[PDB]
From a paper:
Ribonucleotide reductase (RNR) is a key enzyme in all domains of life, utilizing radical chemistry for the synthesis of deoxyribonucleotides by substitution of the 2′ OH-group of a ribose 5′phosphate with a hydrogen. The strictly aerobic class I RNRs are comprised of two homodimeric subunits: a large catalytic subunit R1, where ribonucleotide reduction takes place, and a small radical-generating subunit R2. R2a proteins utilize an oxygen-activated di-ferrous metal site to generate a stable FeIII/FeIII-tyrosyl radical (Y·) cofactor, whereas R2b proteins generate a MnIII/MnIII-Y·. R2c proteins generate a MnIV/FeIII cofactor and the recently discovered class R2d—a MnIV/MnIII cofactor. These dimetal centers reside in a ferritin-like scaffold, and are coordinated by two histidine residues and four carboxylate ligands.
Here we show that the class Ib ribonucleotide reductase R2 protein from Bacillus anthracis spontaneously assembles a Mn/Mn cofactor in vitro, under both aerobic and anoxic conditions, when the metal-free protein is subjected to incubation with MnII and FeII in equal concentrations. To study metal selectivity and cofactor assembly from a mixed MnII and FeII pool in the presence and absence of O2, in the present study we describe apoprotein crystal soaking experiments, subjecting apo BaR2b to a large excess of both MnII and FeII in aerobic and reducing anoxic conditions (in presence of 30 mM sodium dithionite). Site-specific metal quantification by X-ray anomalous dispersion on WT BaR2b revealed that the two sites of the metal center predominantly bind Mn irrespective of the presence or absence of O2 in the experimental setup. Unlike R2lox and R2c, wild-type BaR2b is able to select Mn over Fe in both binding sites. The capability to exclude Fe appears central for a protein requiring a di-Mn cofactor for function. If Mn binds in both positions, neither the wild-type nor the L61G reacts with O2.
Residue numbers in the entry:
A (entry chain A): 1 to 275, 279 to 288
B (entry chain B): 1 to 275, 278 to 288
Write the structure that this text describes.
């Protein structure tokens, strides 16, 4: 039975990602958010509701990535150095999820917070979206998996990391780009910095597996990947309509979703399928 | 589908362990080990071989705990806050494993290191020991698991964290207690500080699951736990004989293995099954 041996590289990238993950390490106690109250109270009721809802959705996605996506993809890897990186990335998803609770503590009463999480749990689009992704992860709950199954779990993971978060990240970035909720915006920026390298890394692992598949299997997963992309897109467009119609931002968020869907495809070595908002860009500064 | 909500406690302990795991965060770059070369050369060939072999075994156990034990237990937990803690603990196992490579880079040539890892991979007792533990983890590779299966995976994990590491930890502690390889000893002490909390936490989770089982299932897993304890003990005694006979430490290590097996049992809420810590080892823990 093999032990991980870092003195003999298993690939040309795991060590750099290991070091970068650790270089980026942070926790919610580093960013105090109480000063956001002064701009929080300036938001309309509809704006506050949208913000809380998107952060609830982000919390759900990080919960599933740390508790299902990273663990189940990493248990089936043969590359022990890449497994190490994924384990750390999974822990960081739990840091991310806990940081949303830190934001909530400042922006909402205890009763308001539990209402957010009840809304998350009973929400049909969030259930459908998370169910589609986790179906690929739960396919790995068996002793022997195929490379097509592992590849598609990695595709699902890249799509979560590089694409499904972004209908939610839009709004904290959009507000922070205007000087509103900038401390929470700093947290979201730290989260994004992590998700960006998560998506690149899992996409490298996916491309390595893809190269080992037969031509027939390659065709099959290419079709599944394109179909998954567009299945998620239809759900995202329903989600942005539900969240953002009240505040007039639906088409802006949709443009942002498509930009990030293209980045997810590129992380997998695939061509873009869709043809950044300048305020969001200022929030990423 | 539920998202983790830290503003409503799911249990009385996960937040405390979350905070403590983070308070204890470290990486290998924080302890330079080059100064250990001066005492490494004072050791005999047999002492150096023993040290490299036990660190190889430790690396294997951490590799399996980070890559199988924590992930598969955490997947099946319903408590999202406890899942969060286990994910962080699993990442720390990978930090631990990488820290052994950091020690090796100072103490061995590239060829000597590859020899260590070849020895680990082909070693029959390490394969048997790790295979027993990971068999409990690999029972969780299915869509739905029983509480008996989850409980026994947690028992196996506590036995790894609180018991099976210690035939290996003995020697770095013994040497550090004699002023040898003290920088490496500092790393091992950081690892032990983590494993100690890992075993306590998983043991709490196991006790909670146990209390939820039917009486028939409780009787089954109680017997299986005691059998597993003693099956592992027989293997550990073969392992310590193999590693430590050449340096005259077998009975001392065995004394330390039993002390830690009792701690693992206590972490599970169970009575000790074996009859003070060696004073040199104690000085290495200071
Ligand atoms: Mn995350
Ligand atoms: Mn991520
Ligand atoms: Mn460890
Ligand atoms: Mn541990």
């Amino acid at each position: 039975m093999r032990a991980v041996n870092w003195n003999k590289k298993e690939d040309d990238f795991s060590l750099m990602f290991w070091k970068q993950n650790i270089a980026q390490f942070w926790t919610e106690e580093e960013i105090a958010v109480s000063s956001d109250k002064n701009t929080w109270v300036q938001l309309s009721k509809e704006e506050q509701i949208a913000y809380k809802r998107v952060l609830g959705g982000l919390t759900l996605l990080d919960t599933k990535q740390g508790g299902e996506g990273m663990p189940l993809v990493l248990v089936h890897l043969e590359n022990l150095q890449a497994k190490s990186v994924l384990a750390f990335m999974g822990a960081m998803e739990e840091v991310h999820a806990k940081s949303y609770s830190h934001i909530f503590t400042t922006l909402a009463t205890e009763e308001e917070i539990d209402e957010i999480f009840d809304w998350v749990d009973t929400h049909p689009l969030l259930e459908k979206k998370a169910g589609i992704i986790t179906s690929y992860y739960r396919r790995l709950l068996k002793p022997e998996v195929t490379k097509k199954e592992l590849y598609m779990a990695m595709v699902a993971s890249v799509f979560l990391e590089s694409y499904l978060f972004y209908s939610g990240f839009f709004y904290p970035l959009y507000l922070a780009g205007q000087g509103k909720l900038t401390a929470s915006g700093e947290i979201i920026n730290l989260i994004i910095r992590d998700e960006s390298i998560h998506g690149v890394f899992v996409g490298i692992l996916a491309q390595q597996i893809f190269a080992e598949l037969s031509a027939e299997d390659q065709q099959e997963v290419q079709k599944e990947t394109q179909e998954l992309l567009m299945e998620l897109y239809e759900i995202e467009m329903a989600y942005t309509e539900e969240i953002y119609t009240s505040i007039g931002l639906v088409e802006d968020v949709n443009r942002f979703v498509r930009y990030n869907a293209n980045k997810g495809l590129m992380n997998l070595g695939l061509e873009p399928k869709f043809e950044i908002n300048p305020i969001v860009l200022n929030g990423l500064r």
